[PDB]
Amino acid sequence: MEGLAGYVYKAASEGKVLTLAALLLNRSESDIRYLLGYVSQQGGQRSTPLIIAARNGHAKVVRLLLEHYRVQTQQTGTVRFDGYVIDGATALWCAAGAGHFEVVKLLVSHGANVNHTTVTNSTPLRAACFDGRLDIVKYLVENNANISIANKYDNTCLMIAAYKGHTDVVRYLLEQRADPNAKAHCGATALHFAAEAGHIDIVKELIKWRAAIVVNGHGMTPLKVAAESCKADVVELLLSHADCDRRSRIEALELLGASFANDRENYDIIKTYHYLYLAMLERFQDGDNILEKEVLPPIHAYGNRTECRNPQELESIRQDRDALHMEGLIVRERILGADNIDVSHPIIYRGAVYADNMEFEQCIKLWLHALHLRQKGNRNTHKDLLRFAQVFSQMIHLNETVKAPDIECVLRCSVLEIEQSMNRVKNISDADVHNAMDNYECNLYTFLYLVCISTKTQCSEEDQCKINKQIYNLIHLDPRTREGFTLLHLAVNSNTPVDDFHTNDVCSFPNALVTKLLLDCGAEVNAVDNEGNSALHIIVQYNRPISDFLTLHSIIISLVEAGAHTDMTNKQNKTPLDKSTTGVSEILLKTQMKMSLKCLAARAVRANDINYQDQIPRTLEEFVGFH
C-alpha cells in the first residue's frame, strides 16, 4: 500500500500516466484515494501526487486526476521550495506559482479553490504576481478570485509584483483599480517595494496612477528610500511627482550623494561630489530665504567634521576622498536619523575599506560606532562582533597595538548582545529557535575570541579592571551552549570552531591565558555540561598533548589551584584520570591529585549500589552524585 503510494507519487511527479493508471487498475476508490492521498513528506516537504502533478506542469495528468479519478483540491504541499517550503497549497496555487497557464485554466474550469489562504494566508494571485505570468493573472482576475488578499505582513499581491520587475502584471493589476495605498504594517505603500531594484516603469505607472506618496513605518519617504538605495532614475521620477516640497528635494539629493559615497555596488565619488554640489547650490540658490543645515555635533567616529553648510567648503573637499566619505556618512546620519535600519551597513562598508587598507584605528572607530548604533536599534549584531574579532586578530598578527578602551567597549557590547540574545532564545520557544541558538553560540565564540585578544594585549590597571568586570558580569550570568558547555568548558576544549580569517592566526584553542583569566575572573570551575563531563575531563582528552604541553601544564595547574575536584567521575562513570587517553595528562593529574575524603573513599560505595537517598547529608548527596 505505502510502496504503491510511493509508486503513484513518483509516476505523477515524473509525468507518466499509464503507470499509475495500471497501479490504480482493478482497485476500488478507497485504496485509490489513499494512494492519491499520499501527503507524506518527500525531500523534507509534504507533497501529493495531485500537487506534484500540478507542480510538474503536465495538464494531461491533472485532467485525468480531476475527471477520471476522485481527488480534491484541498491539499497540503509546497508553495515556494527555495527558502519558504510553506504548507497548505492548492493545486491551482502550485500551478500558478510554477507558471503553467494551461494547468491553471484547467483547474479553474474544473472548479479549484481560488481564494485559499495558507498559514501565511497567501493567495495564488500573489503567486502569479511573483511569477510574473500575465495570462495567469488575467485568467484569475476574469474569474474574480480577489485583489486584496495580503500576507500576514499585510503584503499585497500588488506589492509583491512591484518588488519584482513585472511591470505588465503591475499595470494590469492596477487596471483592476486595486489601490496603491495598501499600506503594509512593515511600511510599504507599493512604491517603497518598487524602489529597491529600481523598476523605472513600475514607478512611472504608479506615479501615473496616483500612488499617493506617504512615509513608511521607518518614517522614510519612498523618495528617501530610493535615494538610500542609490537608484538615481527612480529618484528623478519621485522628485518629478506631486509636491516638490523643496526641503524634501534637497534632503533627497543629499541622501543620494551620501548613499553613493559609501555603497559597495555603486561607488562613484565624483557622482557623490556633484550630487552634493546640486544640494548645496539649490540650498544657496535664492540668496535670501535660504535654507540651512541644522547644527548637529561632530560625531567622533567620522573624525570631527561638521558637514558642509557652505558651497565654498564643499568645494574645498572636492578631491579629499576620506573627507568625502566622512561627509557622506555624516549627512546620511543626519537625514536618515539614528534609529533607521539602513544607516549601519554603509558605516560597516567604509570600515571594511579602511581595514583592508590597514588604517586600523579609523576602522575600529567606525565599526564601534556601527555597533553602538546597531545595539541602540537592538538588531542582530553577531556578524559585527565577528568582524571585530577578525580585525583584532589581524591587528595582533600585524603586531599593531590594540586600544584597551575599544576592546572594553566591544566586550561590553558583546555581553549585552548575548544577554538580549538569550532573552530572545527564551522568548522564541520553537518558532525560530534554531538560528537564534546558532547565533547565540557564535556570540559565545566571538566572546572567547575577544577575550583571547584581550589576553594577547597589554592594558593598564583600570582597563584590565573594566575587562574583568565585563567578563565577570557574563560569567555571573552564566551562559551555556547547546551542548551544555559553560564558558570555561568552551575555553578548555580543542574542537571550538575558529573563523577562517585572521582569528586562526591567534585564536588557538585551548589557550592557557584565556582559561587563567576566566578562572581568576570567578568562573564556575566545577561546572558540568549536558554530557556530564567537566573542564578537567575535556582538557585531558586533548589530542595534541605535547604539541603545546606548557599550555596544558598551565591549565591543569590552574584548575587544581581553583576548585576542580580531580576525581569528579562524570555521569557515565568515568573519572577524568580514566579519560586521560595520554600519559602526559595522567602523569600531570597524578602529580596534582590529592589524597582525599569520601571521593576515593566513596568510589567503591558508589560502584556498589549503596543507597544514599537521604541516608547521607544534603550536600553529601551531590558529593556522592559526582563521585
Binding site: 499509464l18 487498475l25 482493478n26
Partner: protein, 72 residues
C-alpha cells in the same frame, strides 16, 4: 506476447510494454510505440475500461492510428 499469463505479466511485464511505447511516444516513432502499446492492451487483464484512457494519451494522428491497429 507473454502467452497471456494469469497474474504475472498482467501487471509486471505489462508496465514495460506501455513504457516501450511511452518512450517511443517521446521518441516520435509512434508506429513502433503503437506496436508496444497494442501488445499490452491484448495482454491487459481489463483493457475495455482503458478505451477511454488510451483515446487521449496520444497525438491526434495516433488517435485513430492506434485504433486501427488496436485489434492487431
Amino acid at each position: 506476447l507473454p502467452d497471456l499469463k494469469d497474474a504475472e505479466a498482467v501487471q509486471k511485464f505489462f508496465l514495460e510494454e506501455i513504457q516501450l511505447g511511452e518512450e517511443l511516444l517521446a521518441q516520435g516513432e509512434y508506429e513502433k510505440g503503437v506496436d508496444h502499446l497494442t501488445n499490452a492492451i491484448a495482454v491487459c487483464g481489463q483493457p475495455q475500461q482503458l478505451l477511454q484512457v488510451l483515446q487521449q494519451t496520444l497525438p491526434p494522428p495516433v488517435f485513430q492510428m492506434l485504433l486501427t491497429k488496436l485489434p492487431t
